[model samples]
Target: AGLADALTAPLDHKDKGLQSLTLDQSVRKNEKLKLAAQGAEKTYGNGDSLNTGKLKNDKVSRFDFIRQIEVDGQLITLESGEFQVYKQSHSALTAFQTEQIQDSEHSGKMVAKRQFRIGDIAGEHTSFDKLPEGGRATYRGTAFGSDDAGGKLTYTIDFAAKQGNGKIEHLKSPELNVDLAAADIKPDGKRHAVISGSVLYNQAEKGSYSLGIFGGKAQEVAGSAEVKTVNGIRHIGLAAKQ
Candidate 1:
């Protein structure tokens, strides 16, 4: 009689506890990404540019974690474990980059790699920070535009910088702005866009060191370079400037 009653009770079960299963799955998914980013940091030297290559190898892991939480989902509460992980990792990387920029040893190679990494993190962080739970954002922008010969050309400069508080800030029209005037087509069937501008840097300490972007031209051909800076500072390639 007891066994029969137990089996019959199973058949009549109508509890709504099954809804908890979905919540459990959601929490687990969030945990997984947090673990992946943590593991990547452990292996990649916490944004050390010297370990930049190793960091590249773990890009899949970091990006995967980002993709999971940053989509159209429940807004993560500030008190939640998932939000804590996101905030911690973001702060850690930003802090590391700030130190690297100040360290003279990390001047050249470190600067280049750090700049690229900053771009990567800024994209993810900005999108995540602005949206609420269940919110979504589709980002799109123009970097460069060109017109026919003797017309005006334009470029949009964007960048990310680490503030003293160890936070990464994205700048759309960073102190570096450039204007290009389209010149007449040359005998080589190519038109030139003359570049002119000045970039402001280190306003607080150095009181604004300006780097001029002038005396350069871009050929109208595809894959041609544009916007060279003076003093062998190298051309701010069109792809990068925009």
Candidate 2:
């Protein structure tokens, strides 16, 4: 059920503000199903909400992710599993599963990590203004990661050629085509951009995108794609620029 109590439950970083994490809103499965803890491109109509985001401070030690989107057009599963807080401050806190890192070449500095789900389509931002350059923008929402439900997507952005292109339209065959490259974007202000690219069923893969260029201009360009699949299938996407 809850993924085996989220693999040993203990990531729920005790947050109390900013709508802090949600689940048990009667833990729905019907009656307009709902979930809480929302952020990024605001649209909580389908499964209610769970784009995921909370914990205002604590320097964020970790966060897992999961976004199975496609609102309005139906299909929604926004999961942002537990939370974690505790690096060294010991009063009593210990939970384990198994996972961490530390390497060479670049000076190792990672301590520990076994993190699990905490998807936040884009992530906390009730406000971020900066998104205006030249022109060329088009968007339409829907389309998400895996576990069923994902389709209807259309993107066309060109912030002076930072690049953007997409198409997922009702899949079952076409392998859902897509290609977006955002040169790591940095128009130098503040809005955020890290639009990665490439996605094909069995040829090439790699997509870790994010772009919530709201407020500034070009209407509203919301985004969040985290597709990196060769088999485990994790294709993500969502848009809204009108």
Candidate 3:
């Protein structure tokens, strides 16, 4: 069996100071196979080692690593140093599940059930993240129909913090309460969707803030900020840049 072979494979580490290492294997069923492997090595030295910065004798000085893999009929996922895989099949019903723990005092879970049909797909997802010192964020979203067919996606986000300090996008906030919602719709034969939404904030500390998008490009835009204080409550609004 493939599992048996994997368990029996030998890992070799040899050389005086450092040496490269690797592992390769394949498991097959009736001439079809999936394979993956990884290898790496690092050298450690005393504080005066050449060219390398000062490090303890047992500390890593340099290293190289690589990981590759493929599994037929399965999906792999990793988050926060945890790895997992789930079985897959050609079917209309599918389910997704995950759990996250930031520490002994903070944790959350999410589950989604999905169905695929010829003309449409439907699913719902919810998640929550909590902090030890009384801060949390929750999210909910649902999808239906084809985006081109005026399909609508709805989202709800709620966030709060009490007697705490944290930074989002380099902006420090001592306390906050915010809720937001949006209706997203894709235009005909276009890649970008239009979003219209409203935001409500009950109390917020005064500070400059910046938000940045990672992994995706957003259309060029500009905006103006209007800040006002009402009865000691900070209110800030953005007006589309002229």
TM-score per prediction, in order, is: 0.18, 0.27, 0.16
**Candidate 3 local lDDT, 1-242, one digit each (tens):** 12222223422233322122111121112222122223322222111111111112111112111122224754222112111111111101111111321232323332332211111111111111111223232222111111111111122212232211111111123332233332232232122222233333335423231111111222111111122234332222111100
Q: Write the per-residue lDDT of candidate 1 for residues 118-191, one digit (tens) a residue.
A: 11111111121222233211111112211111112233212122100111123333333232222221122123
Between candidates 1 and 3, name the one with more favorable lDDT.
3
- Report lDDT per candidate: 0.20, 0.40, 0.21
| Candidate structures ordered by lDDT, highest first | 2, 3, 1
Task: Show where candidate 3 strays beyond 4 Å.
Answer: 1-172, 177-179, 185-194, 203-218, 223-242
Tell me the number of clashing residue pairs for each predicted model: 1, 8, 0
lDDT of 2 by residue, 1-242 (tens): 23223233334554333223333331334333322233312222333322123222212233333334444676534333333322111111111122343433344344454332223332233333355456777777655345323466666767677676665566665654443443335443343454545544423666555555543345555444556565553534343545
Q: So what's the TM-score on candidate 1?
A: 0.18
After superposing candidate 1 on the true structure, give the runs of residues whose Cα lies further than 4 Å from its correct spot: 1-171, 189-221, 236-242
Error of 1 at 76 (Å): 46
- In model 1, the number of clashes is 1
In terms of lDDT, model 2 sits at 0.40
**Clash pairs, model 2 backbone:** 11-83, 12-83, 13-83, 64-118, 65-118, 65-119, 66-119, 80-118
